[PDB]
Each structure stands twice: as C-alpha cells, then as structure tokens.
Amino acid sequence: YKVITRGMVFERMMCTSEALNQTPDMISATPARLTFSQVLVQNPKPIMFRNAGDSSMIDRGLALAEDVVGSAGDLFDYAVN
Amino acid sequence: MINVSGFGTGIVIVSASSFPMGFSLSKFADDESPISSKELEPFGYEMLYDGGLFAFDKAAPLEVSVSVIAGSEDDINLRILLNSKKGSFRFLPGIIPDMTTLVATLPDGGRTVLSNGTIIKGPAIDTIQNTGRRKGNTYTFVFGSYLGAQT
C-alpha cells in the first residue's frame, strides 16, 4: 500500500499490526490503531521496458525435468491437429 | 406539621477501654453543626460496553462529626478520647477501643446505635477566632455499623 498522510507519500507500505478497541466510551464506532512498516527494497527506482521483446533474461537454474508417458505417436497426432 | 428541631438531642459515647461506662455529650457548639455526617455510599455502578448498567456493593464508612463548646466537660472528655493511642491497649478479634455512640435525637426516641467505630480526627488545642471567642471544637469519628434506628 501507499500512505499519503499530509503531503508525505510513503510507497511499499505493509500493514504490520492492528488493535481494535471496544469500550463503553464509544458504542457506535470503534477506535483502532493501525501500524504499517515499509518494505525495504534494493532498488527503490527500478528500470522497466515498454515493449514485450526486450526483457533481461531470467535464469531458473537446474530443473529436474519431470516425467510423462505419452509416446511419440501422441505427440505426432497433437502436432498434426 | 413536622417538627425537625434538634433541641434536646443527647449523645452517649461508650468506648471499650478509655470510657467503659461512657460519657454524655449535651453541650453542643453554637456556630458549627452539632452533628454532621458525610453521605453514605454503600453501592456503586459500572458501565458495560453495550451501554448497560451494573450495580454492586462497595465498602462504606459512616463519617460522623460532633461539635462541642470549647472548654466544656464534653470537650475535655473528647480530648481524652483523642489522646489515647491504639497501641497502648490490648487486642481482641474486635477493633481496638470499639466506641459506640447512642444518639437520642429527640424526645421522639430516634435511638441511633452507631457502633463498630473509632475517633479519627479533632482539634488538639483551642483556636481563638478574630472576634476573640474560642471556636467550637469538631471531633470526627468513623463507624462501620450504621443500623439500629427506631421510630
């Protein structure tokens, strides 16, 4: 979330705590004490790209390719269709 | 008509040790209130979080205060009562010098039987006012038994 209190904008704000209070002093509404903490990021100003071609490459490391039983005939028939 | 006069009121103060037979107060002060009692508060109320009300019992002492003319025999006896430390007497499951005041409030026979109490405060020496007349002396007692009224 982004909290704009009074000319003071805080981005990357996440709720950490909240306390609701129900008292005889206020029977209609409920006082509450929200508490947010900021999420620290390495680069507060990231660099993006407009068009879909030009991303930097993302590595996934080792995969351990999992298994199916479909045989080459099914793959062929799928490619035919 | 209702007669709410105070003339003829007598007090009999009997203490466990200082005055086992007791003494009598009849010479009350002319300027201060002869008998003055704070309002007893034997109940209390609390508010629930839904706006409701709860009523409970609370401890309530009876704070009485009697005013007597400076220099009188009643004043001397009350000073004797005041200048008697609780540590100089023996001890019982009851209170240290249990002193009770029988109040005959009128010829009606009110017969207030305030008991289970002790003296708390009072004047040690007589104060001389601006006018030159010694101020009436007011002695305060506290009590825990406040029942026995008749008529």
Residues in chain A: 81
Among B143, B132, B7, B6, smallest CA distance to B70 is for B132
Report chain B residues touching chain A, CB-CB < 8 A.
47-51
- DSSP codes, B1-19: ------TT-EEEEEESSS-
Tell me which chain A residues have a C-beta less than 8 angstroms from the C-beta of B49: 22-24, 27
Neighbours of B18 (CB within 10 A): 20
| Phi, psi (deg, nearest 5) at residue B118 | -155, 160
Give the resolution to one decimal, in Å.
3.3
Beta bridge partners of A32: A20
Compute φ and ψ for B121, nearest 5 degrees. -145, 165
Helix, coil or strand: residue A63: coil
User: What's the gap between Cα A64 and its chain centre?
Assistant: 27
Query: Do the Cβ atoms of B9 and B106 come closer than 8 Å?
Result: yes
Residue type (1 letter), A28: S
Report d(CA A53, CA A55) in Å as an integer. Answer: 6
- Sorted by sequence, the CB contacts under 8 Å of residue B114 that are 6+ apart come out as B62, B64, B100, B101, B103, B143, B145, B146, B148
Q: Which residues pair with residue B11 across a beta bridge?
A: B25, B103
* Cα–Cα distance list, A69 to A48, A66, A72, B59 (Å): 41, 11, 10, 85
Task: Mutate one of B45, B46, B49 to test the A interface: name it (highest A CB count within 10 A).
Answer: B49
Cβ–Cβ gap A27/B50 under 8 Å:
yes
Q: How far apart are CA B116 and CA B99, in angstroms?
A: 7
Instruction: List, in sequence order, every beta strand (DSSP E) within chain B.
Output: 10-15, 23-25, 35-37, 43-47, 53-57, 62-68, 99-104, 115-121, 137-145
Amino acid at position A33, single letter? R
CB B96 within 8 A of CB B18: no
Closest residue by Cα to residue B125 from B70, B68, B77, B73? B70
B-chain CB neighbours of A23 within 8 Å are: 49
- Residue B74, SS3? helix
Cβ contacts of A21 on chain B, cutoff 8 Å? none
> Which among B89, B85, B76 is positioned nearest to B124, based on CA atoms?
B76
- Residue B81, classed as helix, strand or coil, is helix
DSSP state of B87: G
Structure tokens at A51: 């068009």
Q: Classify residue B71 as left (phi > 0), alpha (psi -120 to 50) or beta.
A: left
Q: Are B78 and B70 a contacting pair, CB within 8 Å?
A: no
Residue found under tokens 């209070």: A21
Q: How far is A36 from chain B (nearest CA, A)?
A: 28
Exposure string over B128-148, b if 16+ CB within 10 A, otherwise e: eeeeeeebbbbbebbbeebee
Which residue's entry shows tokens 């508490």? A35
Give the number of A-B residue pairs with CB atoms closer than 8 Å: 10
**Integer Cα distance of B49 and B16 in angstroms:** 49
Give the up-direction half-sphere exposure of residue B78: CA atoms within 13 A in the CB hemisphere. 33
| Yes or no, beta carbons of A23 and B49 under 8 Å apart | yes
Q: How many CB atoms lie within 10 A of CB B100?
A: 19
Q: Mark B25-42 as b/e (b = at least 16 C-beta within 10 Å).
A: beebbeebebbeeeeeee
